[PDB]
Amino acid sequence: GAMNSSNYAELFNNDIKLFVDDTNVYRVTVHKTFEGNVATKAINGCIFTLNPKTGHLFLKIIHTSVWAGQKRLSQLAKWKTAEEVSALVRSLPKEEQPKQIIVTRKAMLDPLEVHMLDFPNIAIRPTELRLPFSAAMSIDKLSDVVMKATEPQMVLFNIYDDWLDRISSYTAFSRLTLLLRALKTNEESAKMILLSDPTITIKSYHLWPSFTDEQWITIESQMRDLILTEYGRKYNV
Amino acid sequence: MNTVPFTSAPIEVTIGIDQYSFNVKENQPFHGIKDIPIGHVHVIHFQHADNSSMRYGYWFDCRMGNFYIQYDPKDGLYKMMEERDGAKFENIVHNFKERQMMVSYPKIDEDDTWYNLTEFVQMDKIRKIVRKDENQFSYVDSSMTTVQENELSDPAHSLNYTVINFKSREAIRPGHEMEDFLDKSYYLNTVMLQGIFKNSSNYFGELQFAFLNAMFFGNYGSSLQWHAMIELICSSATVPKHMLDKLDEILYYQIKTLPEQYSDILLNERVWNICLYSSFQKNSLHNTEKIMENKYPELL
Numbered sequence: 001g002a003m004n005s006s007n008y009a010e011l012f013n014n015d016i017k018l019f020v021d022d023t024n025v026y027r028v029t030v031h032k033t034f035e036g037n038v039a040t041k042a043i044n045g046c047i048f049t050l051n052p053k054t055g056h057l058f059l060k061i062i063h064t065s066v067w068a069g070q071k072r073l074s075q076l077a078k079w080k081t082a083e084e085v086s087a088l089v090r091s092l093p094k095e096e097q098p099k100q101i102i103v104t105r106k107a108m109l110d111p112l113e114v115h116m117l118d119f120p121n122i123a124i125r126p127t128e129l130r131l132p133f134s135a136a137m138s139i140d141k142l143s144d145v146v147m148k149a150t151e152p153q154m155v156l157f158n159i160y161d162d163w164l165d166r167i168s169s170y171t172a173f174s175r176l177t178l179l180l181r182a183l184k185t186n187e188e189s190a191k192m193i194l195l196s197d198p199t200i201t202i203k204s205y206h207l208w209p210s211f212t213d214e215q216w217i218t219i220e221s222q223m224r225d226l227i228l229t230e231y232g233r234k235y236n237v
Numbered sequence: 238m239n240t241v242p243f244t245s246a247p248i249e250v251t252i253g254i255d256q257y258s259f260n261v262k263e264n265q266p267f268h269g270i271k272d273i274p275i276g277h278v279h280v281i282h283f284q285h286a287d288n289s290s291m292r293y294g295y296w297f298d299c300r301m302g303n304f305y306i307q308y309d310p311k312d313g314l315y316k317m318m319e320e321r322d323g324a325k326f327e328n329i330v331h332n333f334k335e336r337q338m339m340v341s342y343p344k345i346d347e348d349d350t351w352y353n354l355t356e357f358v359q360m361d362k363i364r365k366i367v368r369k370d371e372n373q374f375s376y377v378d379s380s381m382t383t384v385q386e387n388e389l390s391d392p393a394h395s396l397n398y399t400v401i402n403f404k405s406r407e408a409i410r411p412g413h414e415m416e417d418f419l420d421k422s423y424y425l426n427t428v429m430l431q432g433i434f435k436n437s438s439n440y441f442g443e444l445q446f447a448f449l450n451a452m453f454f455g456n457y458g459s460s461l462q463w464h465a466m467i468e469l470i471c472s473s474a475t476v477p478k479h480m481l482d483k484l485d486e487i488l489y490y491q492i493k494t495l496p497e498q499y500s501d502i503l504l505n506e507r508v509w510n511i512c513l514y515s516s517f518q519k520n521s522l523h524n525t526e527k528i529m530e531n532k533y534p535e536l537l
């Protein structure tokens with residue numbers, strides 16, 4: 001059924017699975033019109049589809065032209081997500097197709113199940129985890145490629161860089177969610193943490209900085225402090 | 238007017254004849270039911286006093302043969318049979334009527350209730366839902382499952398209703414995934430009406446028969462079938478005007494006839510609120526919404 005704390009290690013077994021997050025598919029800026037009414041202007045979006053075992057990120061960029069002349073965009077966005085995920089599975093060789101697709105919001109279940117009727121043996125699942133994938137646009141290299149796109153476009157990233165050379169998937173996933181949780185709670189502080197020391201750089205071919213094991217422990221500690229802090233500043237404790 | 242005689246009544250039993258019912262005591266001198274209106278299907282049904290488990294019964298049309306009831310002490314139920322010897326049968330019936338051992342089907346002359354609940358129900362179609370081709374009448378009970386239920390186990394004792402499934406390839410055209418899931422008109426009009434049922438009358442007939450098996454036998458699969466067929470219409474943006482008006486009448490009488498105390502298990506809260514208040518047809522079931530709101534405002 002749903003995915004939660006009790007079955008957490010299933011993410012890192014050898015059954016191919018994808019997380020799909022739709023929270024940045026339809027993005028808008030709300031503004032005032034000359035008449036003093038309110039209007040929205042859409043900006044480019046993305047589907048965040050992630051293999052938590054390997055780090056492969058299928059970032060499907062959603063160009064604002066896909067909304068032109070459409071109604072009920074929030075609802076259409078779920079179906080467009082589903083249509084693009086289904087197109088991706090079909091593009092993958094059989095032995096690469098996921099056995100399960102986990103959606104980070106339940107409103108995606110029906111749109112995805114309908115689009116994947118041709119794949120009766122792929123399980124579509126929800127999750128009880130509150131995953132911070134909406135913060136994926138706080139990663140500079142991903143935001144940049146999304147905002148620059150002039151047409152629909154898929155770019156294939158590895159969200160873990162080469163961490164899997166040194167750490168297991170479970171630990172890599174835990175680092176990733178701690179980084180994203182931090183960027184979602186206080187983006188400026190989080191980014192300050194990751195880039196204060198000019199001697200640690202982001203490789204041209206890497207999303208995140210080149211931290212040693214020791215520096216990563218320091219970093220990870222600093223992000224937990226941030227998340228507990230902001231939880232005080234927010235709740236006054 | 239026709240007659241279903243009873244050989245005897247050896248066990249205490251509540252006997253239903255359409256929407257009527259009466260109590261017969263163990264070995265009371267009861268020899269059946271007379272004055273049954275020709276022109277309609279009918280259902281005669283049974284709940285034993287000792288074991289209220291297993292409501293069961295028989296759908297029949299008296300134009301199709303002379304039928305009677307005989308208790309079977311081995312199988313332990315009242316069985317319907319056909320008498321082929323017409324003279325034997327007329328003679329038997331006449332004797333039982335002269336001795337006044339028959340109850341009279343008690344139709345009030347103002348009352349169109351049974352007609353309104355069976356308007357589109359034909360015996361020939363019942364016999365395709367309930368497969369037992371050596372008999373002209375059809376046995377149904379509380380526990381029989383549907384074809385779709387057995388897919389999610391004895392196929393001979395099944396109810397072969399038309400499978401409806403909103404998340405199926407039949408229901409969803411490649412490339413119209415969102416459109417067809419949010420507006421089921423394609424599935425209603427092309428797949429089901431034109432393709433499977435041929436016309437709206439056959440569709441309404443399955444719907445009515447499903448409701449009747451749910452109400453008289455508490456058959457749970459039938460209740461799923463009735464709600465499914467309603468929801469498919471309500472969830473289609475494009476429905477012929479005549480079907481909508483007829484649908485409102487049909488459901489009106491079904492809601493009117495449902496025992497008040499059985500509403501908690503035979504009425505699906507999600508389907509009704511959706512159908513009356515959210516769906517494309519939320520404004521098109523005036524009679525049905527007025528009776529639902531005055532009779533079962535709780536559900537809503």
Ligand SMILES: NNC(=O)c1ccccc1Cl
Nearest residue numbers: 156157158161205206207
């Ligand atoms: N940076 N962009 C990439 O596509 C990439 C390629 C290999 C490994 C890691 C990464 Cl981040």
